[PDB]
Amino acid sequence: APPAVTISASYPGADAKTVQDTVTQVIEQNMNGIDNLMYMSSNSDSTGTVQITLTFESGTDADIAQVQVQNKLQLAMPLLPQEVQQQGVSVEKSSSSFLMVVGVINTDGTMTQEDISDYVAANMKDAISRTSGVGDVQLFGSQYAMRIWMNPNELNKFQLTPVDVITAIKAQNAQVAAGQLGGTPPVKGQQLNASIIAQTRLTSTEEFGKILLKVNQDGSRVLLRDVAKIELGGENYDIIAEFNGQPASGLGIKLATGANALDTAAAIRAELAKMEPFFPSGLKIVYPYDTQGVFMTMVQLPAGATQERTQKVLNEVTHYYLTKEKNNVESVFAVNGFGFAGRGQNTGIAFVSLKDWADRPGEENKVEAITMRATRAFSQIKDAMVFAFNLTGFDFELIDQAGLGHEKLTQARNQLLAEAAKHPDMLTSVRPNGLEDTPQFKIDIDQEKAQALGVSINDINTTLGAAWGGSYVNDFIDRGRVKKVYVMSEAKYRMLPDDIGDWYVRAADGQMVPFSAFSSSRWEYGSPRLERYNGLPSMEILGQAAPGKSTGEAMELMEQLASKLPTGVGYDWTGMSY
Amino acid sequence: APPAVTISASYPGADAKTVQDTVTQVIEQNMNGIDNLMYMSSNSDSTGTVQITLTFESGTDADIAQVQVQNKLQLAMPLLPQEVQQQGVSVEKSSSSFLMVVGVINTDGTMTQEDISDYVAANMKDAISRTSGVGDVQLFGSQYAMRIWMNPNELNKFQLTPVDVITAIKAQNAQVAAGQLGGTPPVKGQQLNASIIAQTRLTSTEEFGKILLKVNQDGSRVLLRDVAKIELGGENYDIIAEFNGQPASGLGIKLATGANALDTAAAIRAELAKMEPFFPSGLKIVYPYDTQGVFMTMVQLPAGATQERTQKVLNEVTHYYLTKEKNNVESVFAVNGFGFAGRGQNTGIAFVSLKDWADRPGEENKVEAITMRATRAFSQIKDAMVFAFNLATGFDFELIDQAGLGHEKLTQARNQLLAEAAKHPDMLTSVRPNGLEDTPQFKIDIDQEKAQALGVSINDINTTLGAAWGGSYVNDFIDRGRVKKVYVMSEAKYRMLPDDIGDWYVRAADGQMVPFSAFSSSRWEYGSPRLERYNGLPSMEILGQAAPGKSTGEAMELMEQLASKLPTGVGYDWTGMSYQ
Amino acid sequence: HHHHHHGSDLGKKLLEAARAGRDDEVRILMANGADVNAADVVGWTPLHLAAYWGHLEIVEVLLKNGADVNAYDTLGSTPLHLAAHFGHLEIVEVLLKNGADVNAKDDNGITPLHLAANRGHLEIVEVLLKYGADVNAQDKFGKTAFDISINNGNEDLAEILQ
Amino acid sequence: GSDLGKKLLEAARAGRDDEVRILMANGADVNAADVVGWTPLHLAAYWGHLEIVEVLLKNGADVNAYDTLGSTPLHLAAHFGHLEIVEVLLKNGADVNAKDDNGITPLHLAANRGHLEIVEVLLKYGADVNAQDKFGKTAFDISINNGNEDLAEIL
């Protein structure tokens, strides 16, 4: 297989265009002087994430490819936003499919899904990630952060903003280098040498709660707990898993390019066996997907679907396997928010593990017939592509060659797809691989009114982004492990457009100004997932030869249709069609 | 040619010494513990450029050399000025000469040199730079940036400085992460989920023009177009090219160490064939130099030479080929501002392509005799080293400051050696420095006591001077869907003469506008436009030849004896062709 | 004019077809009783979607079948705001010819004239003025179309406004 | 005076009960002090060694020895939640209102770590509930700032 190197980065609270224009394009412009690179592609998403896939010529040494990528990225790191650099960028050389899933449950039901995910992140994931052969590890859940959930009514009451909260956290959750008594070079005759210990990272919600924001006129104190709820909770809340219907977390493990699948799998099991004796009571490892025996079910809803509707589709899939197929299925490990195409509110995946082969007699009880029955059973679920499969037509890229812009490229794509639909004798299921535009809330800050009132643009933008998007402030120590601190609005103050107006910013004169005084808003459409191909805006299109036609004939037609598109739109073949 | 890794960096507005002392030295101090390294050399220039070349033993794996050099470079990266880090430091493993040049012209005349250069930078270069076997690509021109050309009279009139302009551009040309309505974790039951879109990068001169700098007490508005001209223009204006006397740009492509030339050239043509159908009208690729059928002409003027003077000499050279050699010469792609010495205002190169082998009968129409005649015709050009050659027996000597003597003493020592060498025409011919002479520079002293008394901060003073006279990369914008840079700099007419220094005002902590002349003094002095180093010490490279039928060996022996008489603390070494 | 969001199968299909420009499917759906003022979660009706995405024939079908020409989204914006903003001249005429409120203000005080002005859509500005648009209407920050022309340096628009 | 003093400081620190009984038998200074002014009793109180505490007190260890920053064995026991040790010290005459150089009392330290039984014992022995440190703070202020309502009840 041509080896592929993946770059992943994240920007908390960024939309797709922000990610693309401050991260993705910057990295892509700096991926020069790297040997044997066949093509590059990227996705920049509304989850605040980017993934750039560099695919190398067959026979390239994947170690050298990865090293060259890492080094060019290192030289491009200073060009990226600090918010991105501080999350960690990763660069992996792995297969795109899972080798195995390690599931974790609590059999006594005494730990929640969120607790289980933190346990796995904090105690299991890093040792697995260092195991030789392990190329990529996806946590099905999130590690805890210290979550400061801000209340805008209380902030306004005390004439404070998220800027004041961030500043205080940085000052009062600090790890200070303070030198030594009797330190070198010392005076003659010194008898005592000792470290000076000053501030240290906070370790508990109680300590964060007592951070001192201000002292009032009369000397009453405003504590962080007076303007916020303080709790451990996920760095994000995007991925939730279940195992046979019960709360779960786990690790999805991808094999490093060229590593041995059996040897890697055995090293992983040996590492889990070291951890098991120290698990808290009730915790238990399950094995829902070891690469017959197993298959997956993809769940892909249209862009704009909620966590709640994705969950409802996964519950239907899970229910089908645990009732209709209960004689053939041992387990289902279902993940809401992650799918075949990675992270998103509208995607899920279910890993299905079959009972022993010997206890599934009959052609009708083998993986092929089971997946085909399941796909049929799921083919009438509304507004969701749901199919059951195991880990070829064509793979086409439409390309913006002339600075046309997303809206024109979408029009050209739709023209091509309309034309393809008029040749059902040659082409079948000609579709986009990505996502459609959805409604977004466009807010314009009025620079004149802000200046007139003495409100800083930096205070406005920090207030908006920290409250509605979340902001990683600094680190703290949870049970001996370094973890992140996040400030964000409590949920109830960031749900609806009128909530925008309950956020106040402090002007240079000390007056509190509501967001409504200096902003206006409207609905518009934009992309939740912007694609690029060899450094240019792109839209991927899949499809196949109609029955009794060759792949070549269908490709030739696609090219003929593509030659009649608006000026400045090109194309290229990729993946299986390269 | 033993393999070489090159480190390149750029500090806009920096003089050679500032580059050397804030970038070059910091990097070089980490260049040890690298396997199979023969030697290191560097140039630090008043274009604000540094290049460090590390030369490895024959048969070294160039991937591994590049990896090991970059490893050591990362030790220095956090110590480099942010301005250098933000330009993107490069580490390349290329041949030092060009495999080919791809020229671009517009046969409808509807694009200037500047437009062509932006088109190539924005639509062509990146793809070529990613092509396997391409070691280095040189653009003959510059990508557009958004240029804000400040007027100091207008800024002073509104009690504004370049700091206020820069601040406003960072605040109003911004790309804001603003979160979501209804994002996770939500109130259960939430149906609405949408991204919040707030400020986004600016895309046009019109948007930059309406950036709001201030609101007066009376309510009137000072916009950025009230203090500045706003236009798209090169990141820099140092490199200009022509193809047969018409506006052009191009890409100079060098081969990656060890890569296959036939294959790489072919991959480059296949990439150009994908681009061609999307060109705007008039735009055409031309092929002025495929490596014999070709040769080059180097133009090297003295340091201090303006762009206009180098152009005058390039015009003579192109004139010669297009008149005198018009039966032999198909084309000349001439580049002012770049040459064999790399980037510089007193340097150019001409790439010459000959007609078919078949149409140039006779010895006198072959490349050797053409270049001999050319070199002879250009031998009379005043105050310029001009020669024509296609593509052994000199020597390559490094005089080295080994005692902290400093540039001025090292120059004196070099002149002493060069005068002594001149008295032995029997053993040594054309013993000469490879580098540049010192030139006048404008020394400005900021008076700290006066600045403190007036309440003018040093950072504001430095940003005002550097941004106005040197240019400052502020942040990025999006031009026709591509991320590009934004630069602020004085409009040309306010940064030409010494008395212009005093037209620039800085705002004190109490709001008063203070002219530069209140807290500064200046004087003329000399300094270097190109500082050289060899194995991490100040150095000056000296080239020459053994006289007719003396061995290089006897020639080197005499240089060593002459060098043994120089002031204490001055040493030497042999490099390049002389190293074995 | 704020139509409630009942994601009722045919209304939801109508919302999707108006968006995507499927003229036929729109005709079929209307003849099968689809609520012509079905709204999505942001308060957009099929007329908003058609006006945004520039689908003239669907705009005409929808109005012929009783679409509320002055439907408001959840921030107060009308189909004519969308069509004026995105430069859909022919839609602007159809809407106005069918009773669109030429002076509708959204929650920010912004009118269609403000939007057309801000993006320099001059033929739209003239049409709106032709239909009674208040040339002096001010948004929440006090800005008129003329102020917009001055801030944007658009002399041709300033000239149309006089 | 003693090389044995230094060994007693180490044995008390590291918990070695037999070694403490022995060094005492052979004459080690029970009030030997290290460079920060910590005596064997300070060390045994900090590190929680109850039987070492009792053994030192019976051999004349000074119950109110203060380190170079004014802290006593009772400060240390109270701060680190060593209940049985707090009682023994107080039974052997520890000054329940001893103030260190910062005006901090054993009750302040117990209150800060939420050691409720210790707060109770200190209070039985006559701890001044209103004693203020250098910043003016009481045990009660500490309970309010830490949000420990059970502690705020008792004071």
Would the CB atoms of A523 and C73 count as touching at under 8 Å? Answer: yes
CATH 1.25.40.20 describes domain D1-155: yes
Asked if A51 contacts B272 with a C-beta cutoff of 8 angstroms, the reply is no
For β-strands A471-478 and B37-45, DSSP reports them as unpaired
> Which of A191, A206, A211, A220 should we substitute to test contact with D (largest number of D Cβ atoms within 10 Å)?
A206
Would the CB atoms of A523 and C106 count as touching at under 8 Å? Answer: no
Of A405, A440, A568, the CB nearest to B194: A440
Closest CA to B339 of B317, B321, B320, B324: B317
A105 strand-pairing partners? A248, A284
Asked if B196 contacts B178 with a C-beta cutoff of 8 angstroms, the reply is yes
Q: Do chains B and A touch (3 or more CB pairs under 8 A)?
A: yes
Say which CATH superfamily domain B392-437+529-580 falls into.
Multidrug efflux transporter AcrB pore domain (3.30.70.1440)
For β-strands A246-256 and A94-106, DSSP reports them as antiparallel
Q: Do chains A and C touch (3 or more CB pairs under 8 A)?
A: yes
CATH 1.25.40.20 describes domain C1-162: yes
Chain B positions touching A83 (Cβ under 8 A) are: 177
Single-letter amino acid, residue C136: N
Closest CA to B152 of B521, B551, B494: B494
- What are the structure tokens assigned to A483, written together? 């973890």
Of D35, D36, D146, the CB nearest to A210: D146
A180 strand-pairing partners? A195
Report how far residue B480's alpha carbon sits from residue A1's, in angstroms, rounded to the nearest whole number. 36
SS3 A184: coil
| Domain spanning A98-143+235-292, CATH class | alpha beta
Asked if B291 contacts B391 with a C-beta cutoff of 8 angstroms, the reply is no
H or E element: which one contains B573? strand B570-574
Asked if B128 contacts B255 with a C-beta cutoff of 8 angstroms, the reply is no
Would the CB atoms of D145 and A210 count as touching at under 8 Å? Answer: yes
Fold exhibited by the domain A293-391:
Alpha-Beta Plaits (3.30.70)
- What are the structure tokens assigned to B135, written together? 């070691």
On the question of a cis peptide bond just before residue B185, with omega within 30 degrees of 0, the verdict is yes
Cβ neighbours of residue A358 under 8 Å, at least 6 residues apart?
Answer: none
Asked if C112 contacts C85 with a C-beta cutoff of 8 angstroms, the reply is yes
Report how far residue A361's alpha carbon sits from residue A530's, in angstroms, rounded to the nearest whole number. 47
For β-strands B90-92 and B4-10, DSSP reports them as antiparallel
For chain A, give the number of residues: 578
Report how far residue B72's alpha carbon sits from residue A512's, in angstroms, rounded to the nearest whole number. 51
- What are the structure tokens assigned to B365, written together? 């129409």
Per-residue burial over A427-438, b = 16 or more CB atoms within 10 Å of its CB, e = otherwise: bbebebbbbebb
SS3 B469: helix
DSSP C39-57: --TTS--HHHHHHHHT-HH
- Closest residue, chain C, to B225 (C-alpha): C153
Closest CA to B225 of B201, B256, B204, B242: B204
What are the φ and ψ backbone dihedral angles of A278, each rounded to 5 degrees? Answer: -105, 5
Report how far residue B312's alpha carbon sits from residue B382's, in angstroms, rounded to the nearest whole number. 11
Of A191, A192, A206, the CB nearest to D147: A206
Report how far residue B452's alpha carbon sits from residue B459's, in angstroms, rounded to the nearest whole number. 12
CA D1 to chain centre: 24
Of B191, B192, B209, the CB nearest to C153: B209
Interchain contact A219–B (C-beta under 8 A): no
B527 strand-pairing partners? B439
Query: A1-97 has which CATH code?
Result: 3.30.70.1430
SS3 B144: strand
SS3 B427: coil
- What are the structure tokens assigned to C78, written together? 């009308």
- What are the structure tokens assigned to B574, written together? 């042999």
SS3 B543: strand
Dihedral sign of CA atoms B274, B275, B279, B283 in order:
negative
D134 CB-contact burial (10 Å; exposed 0-12 / middle 13-18 / buried 19+): exposed
Closest CA to B316 of B401, B228, B393, B379: B379
Would the CB atoms of B192 and C152 count as touching at under 8 Å? Answer: no
Asked if A341 contacts A540 with a C-beta cutoff of 8 angstroms, the reply is no
DSSP classification of residue A301 = P
Asked if B23 contacts B78 with a C-beta cutoff of 8 angstroms, the reply is no
DSSP A2-68: --EEEEEEE-TT--HHHHIIIIIHHHHHT--S-TTEEEEEEEEETTSEEEEEEEEPTT--HHHHHHH
H or E element: which one contains B264? helix B261-275
In chain B, the largest separation of any two C-alpha atoms, in whole Å, equals: 97
Report how far residue A555's alpha carbon sits from residue A427's, in angstroms, rounded to the nearest whole number. 9
Report how far residue B84's alpha carbon sits from residue B71's, in angstroms, rounded to the nearest whole number. 18
Report how far residue D113's alpha carbon sits from residue B91's, in angstroms, rounded to the nearest whole number. 56
Question: Where along chain A do its domains lie?
Answer: 1-97, 98-143+235-292, 144-234+437-527, 293-391, 392-436+528-578
Report how far residue C1's alpha carbon sits from residue B256's, in angstroms, rounded to the nearest whole number. 67
Report how far residue B4's alpha carbon sits from residue A561's, in angstroms, rounded to the nearest whole number. 48
Give the closest-approach CA distance of A230 to chain B in angstroms. 15
Asked if C128 contacts C113 with a C-beta cutoff of 8 angstroms, the reply is yes
Would the CB atoms of A225 and D147 count as touching at under 8 Å? Answer: yes
- What are the structure tokens assigned to B103, written together? 């020229």
Chain C positions touching A521 (Cβ under 8 A) are: 75, 107-108
Give the closest-approach CA distance of C73 to chain B in angstroms. 14
In chain C, the largest separation of any two C-alpha atoms, in whole Å, equals: 50
Would the CB atoms of A79 and B86 count as touching at under 8 Å? Answer: yes
CA distances from A385 to A241, A311, A347, A353, A432 (A): 20, 14, 10, 21, 13
Asked if A573 contacts A397 with a C-beta cutoff of 8 angstroms, the reply is yes
Interchain contact D35–A (C-beta under 8 A): yes
Report how far residue C87's alpha carbon sits from residue C70's, in angstroms, rounded to the nearest whole number. 18
Cβ atoms within 10 A of the Cβ of A312, count? 15
Dihedral sign of CA atoms B78, B81, B84, B87 in order:
positive
- The single residue listed with the structure tokens 């480099």 is B80
Report how far residue B513's alpha carbon sits from residue B456's, in angstroms, rounded to the nearest whole number. 9
DSSP classification of residue A14 = -
- The single residue listed with the structure tokens 């064999």 is B340
Interchain contact C51–A (C-beta under 8 A): no
Helix, strand counts (H, E) of chain C: 10, 0
Chain A positions touching B480 (Cβ under 8 A) are: 403
- What are the structure tokens assigned to B459, written together? 């950072």
Asked if A298 contacts A389 with a C-beta cutoff of 8 angstroms, the reply is yes
* Composition of chain A by helix, strand, coil, percent to 5: 35, 35, 30
Report how far residue D63's alpha carbon sits from residue D89's, in angstroms, rounded to the nearest whole number. 7
Cβ atoms within 10 A of the Cβ of A556, count? 12
H or E element: which one contains B37? strand B37-45
Single-letter amino acid, residue A485: V
On the question of a cis peptide bond just before residue A185, with omega within 30 degrees of 0, the verdict is yes
Closest CA to B154 of B205, B206, B230, B89: B230
H or E element: which one contains C60? helix C56-64
Report how far residue C127's alpha carbon sits from residue C117's, in angstroms, rounded to the nearest whole number. 12
DSSP classification of residue B183 = P
In chain A, the largest separation of any two C-alpha atoms, in whole Å, equals: 97
Q: C13-16, long-range: CB within 8 Å, 24+ apart, which pairs?
A: C14/C38, C14/C46, C15/C39, C15/C40, C15/C44, C15/C45, C15/C46, C15/C49
Report how far residue A539's alpha carbon sits from residue A435's, in angstroms, rounded to the nearest whole number. 10
Closest CA to A159 of A543, A512, A561: A512
H or E element: which one contains C129? helix C122-130
Cβ atoms within 10 A of the Cβ of B549, count? 6
Would the CB atoms of A523 and C141 count as touching at under 8 Å? Answer: no
Cβ neighbours of residue A396 under 8 Å, at least 6 residues apart?
Answer: A540, A541, A542, A543, A558, A562, A571, A572, A573, A574, A577
Resolution number, Å: 1.8
Per-residue burial over B155-190, b = 16 or more CB atoms within 10 Å of its CB, e = otherwise: bbebebbbbbbbbbbebbbbbbbbbbbbbbbbeeeb
H or E element: which one contains B243? strand B240-243
Cβ atoms within 10 A of the Cβ of A195, count? 9
Would the CB atoms of C75 and A439 count as touching at under 8 Å? Answer: no
Query: Could you check whether A1-97 and A98-143+235-292 share the same CATH topology?
Result: yes
- What are the structure tokens assigned to B549, written together? 């039928």
- Print the SS3 string covering A190-222: CCCCEEEECCCCCCCHHHHHCCEEEECCCCCEE
Would the CB atoms of B191 and C41 count as touching at under 8 Å? Answer: yes
> Which alpha helices (H) appear in A258-366, and where do they start and end?
261-275, 307-323
- What are the structure tokens assigned to A88, written together? 């960690």
- What are the structure tokens assigned to B81, written together? 């000025």
Would the CB atoms of C42 and A520 count as touching at under 8 Å? Answer: no
Single-letter amino acid, residue C52: Y
Asked if B239 contacts B336 with a C-beta cutoff of 8 angstroms, the reply is yes
- The single residue listed with the structure tokens 């040792």 is A127
What are the φ and ψ backbone dihedral angles of A102, each rounded to 5 degrees? Answer: -95, 115
Closest CA to A113 of A283, A254, A286: A283
Chain A positions touching C40 (Cβ under 8 A) are: 439
Distance between the two ends of chain D, CA-based, in angstroms?
Answer: 45
Closest CA to D18 of D57, D51, D42, D60: D51
Report how far residue B98's alpha carbon sits from residue B255's, in angstroms, rounded to the nearest whole number. 7
Interface B–C counts its CB contacts (< 8 A) at: 13
Q: Do chains B and D touch (3 or more CB pairs under 8 A)?
A: no
> Which of D34, D145, D150 should we substitute to test contact with A (largest number of A Cβ atoms within 10 Å)?
D145
Closest CA to B46 of B85, B81, B10, B89: B10
CA A161 to chain centre: 28
Cβ neighbours of residue B302 under 8 Å, at least 6 residues apart?
Answer: B346, B383, B436, B437
Report how far residue A382's alpha carbon sits from residue B103's, in angstroms, rounded to the nearest whole number. 56
Report, in angstroms and rounded to the nearest whole number, the Rg of chain B calculated over CA atoms. 27
Distance between the two ends of chain A, CA-based, in angstroms?
Answer: 12
Report how far residue B518's alpha carbon sits from residue B507's, in angstroms, rounded to the nearest whole number. 12
- What are the structure tokens assigned to B189, written together? 């039951």
B459 CB-contact burial (10 Å; exposed 0-12 / middle 13-18 / buried 19+): exposed
- The single residue listed with the structure tokens 């109770």 is D120
Report how far residue B260's alpha carbon sits from residue B271's, in angstroms, rounded to the nearest whole number. 16
Question: Where along chain D do its domains lie?
Answer: 1-155
Report how far residue B162's alpha carbon sits from residue B446's, in angstroms, rounded to the nearest whole number. 18
Asked if A339 contacts A348 with a C-beta cutoff of 8 angstroms, the reply is yes
Which of 348-407 (A) contact B at CB < 8 A? 400-405
Interchain contact A293–B (C-beta under 8 A): no
Report how far residue B150's alpha carbon sits from residue A577's, in angstroms, rounded to the nearest whole number. 52
DSSP B288-330: EEE---EEEEEEEPPTT--HHHHHHHHHHHHHHHHHTTTTTEE
H or E element: which one contains B477? strand B472-479
Asked if A524 contacts A443 with a C-beta cutoff of 8 angstroms, the reply is no
Report how far residue B57's alpha carbon sits from residue B46's, in angstroms, rounded to the nearest whole number. 31
For β-strands B530-534 and B537-546, DSSP reports them as antiparallel
- Closest residue, chain B, to A239 (C-alpha): B184
Would the CB atoms of B179 and A534 count as touching at under 8 Å? Answer: no
Which of 247-286 (B) contact A at CB < 8 A? 256, 259, 274-275, 277-278
Interchain contact C151–B (C-beta under 8 A): yes
DSSP classification of residue A35 = T
Report, in angstroms and rounded to the nearest whole number, the Rg of chain A calculated over CA atoms. 27
Quote the Cα angle for A109-A115-A116, to 5°: 70
Cβ neighbours of residue C83 under 8 Å, at least 6 residues apart?
Answer: C51, C52, C91, C92, C95, C112
DSSP B38-80: EEEEEEEETTSEEEEEEEE-TT--HHHHHHHHHHHHHHHGGGS
Asked if B522 contacts B498 with a C-beta cutoff of 8 angstroms, the reply is yes
Report how far residue B255's alpha carbon sits from residue B271's, in angstroms, rounded to the nearest whole number. 16
Would the CB atoms of A192 and D36 count as touching at under 8 Å? Answer: yes
Asked if A552 contacts B223 with a C-beta cutoff of 8 angstroms, the reply is no
Give the closest-approach CA distance of A507 to chain D in angstroms. 30
CATH 3.40.1790.10 describes domain A392-436+528-578: no
Report how far residue A262's alpha carbon sits from residue A133's, in angstroms, rounded to the nearest whole number. 10
Residues of chain A contacting C, Cβ within 8 Å: 439, 446, 448-449, 497, 520-523, 525
B87 strand-pairing partners? none
DSSP B322-364: HHTTTTTEEEEEEEEEEETTEEEEEEEEEEEEE--GGGS-SGG
Cβ atoms within 10 A of the Cβ of C89, count? 17
Closest CA to D52 of D97, D93, D82: D82
Asked if B206 contacts C153 with a C-beta cutoff of 8 angstroms, the reply is yes
Asked if A452 contacts A201 with a C-beta cutoff of 8 angstroms, the reply is no
